[PDB]
Design a protein around this ligand. Structure first.
Ligand SMILES: Nc1nc2c(ncn2[C@@H]2O[C@H](COP(=O)(O)OP(=O)(O)NP(=O)(O)O)[C@@H](O)[C@H]2O)c(=O)[nH]1
Ligand SMILES: [Mg+2]
Length: 169
């Protein structure tokens, strides 16, 4: 099969671990145990391809994981304006470490079940459109969007691989 190295990045407390554990283990972690660094491997069928997902769940509050990752799940929380503002800085850091302008990424607005919203859907859709990447709203609590976020990132990596192979021709 093909292995895909995915890295979940973003500010503290936005739900990176809860999203990843929903994908891997199908349950919601209600408690908040700040991560040092956790890794998971999951075989899944995406678009009738058997792939191995190697997923790195990073600390919220770097260069090595940015070098290794093939695609980045850039998570903010819709109730945390700073976490949304942080995305630009994560993206610039990744571009710098990769020495490249084209890096597979998906923007994820988590906590979409909460009423305390300070980041509008349009703000985030507009940002993703500028970066040329998908935007998915998710809730690790209700599982809304979880599979879509990770599978979309695999699709972006596949597209990148084709754009690079055709770029070399
Ligand atoms: N209502 C709701 N709570 C969520 C959601 N995602 C995460 N949480 C809660 O938010 C808290 C932090 O989640 P967690 O996944 O640990 O955040 P993190 O981004 O991994 N933090 P760190 O960067 O310190 O490891 C936990 O109490 C978790 O239950 C969500 O979509 N909705
Ligand atoms: Mg965590």
């Amino acid at each position: 099969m093909t292995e895909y190295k995915l890295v979940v990045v973003g500010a503290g407390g936005v739900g990176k671990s809860a999203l990843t554990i929903q994908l891997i283990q199908n349950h919601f972690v209600d408690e908040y145990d700040p991560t040092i660094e956790d890794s998971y491997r999951k075989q899944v069928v995406i678009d009738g391809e058997t792939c191995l997902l190697d997923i790195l769940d990073t600390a919220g509050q770097r260069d090595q994981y940015m070098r290794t990752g093939e695609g980045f799940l850039c998570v903010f929380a819709i109730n945390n304006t700073k976490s949304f503002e942080d995305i630009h800085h994560y993206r610039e850091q990744i571009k710098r470490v990769k020495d490249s302008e084209d890096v597979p990424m998906v923007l994820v607005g988590n906590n979409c079940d909460l009423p305390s919203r300070t980041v509008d859907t349009k703000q985030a859709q507009d940002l993703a459109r500028s970066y040329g990447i998908p935007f998915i709203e998710t809730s690790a609590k209700t599982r809304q969007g979880v599979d879509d976020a990770f599978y979309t990132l695999v699709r972006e990596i596949r597209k990148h691989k084709e754009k690079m192979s055709k770029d070399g021709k």
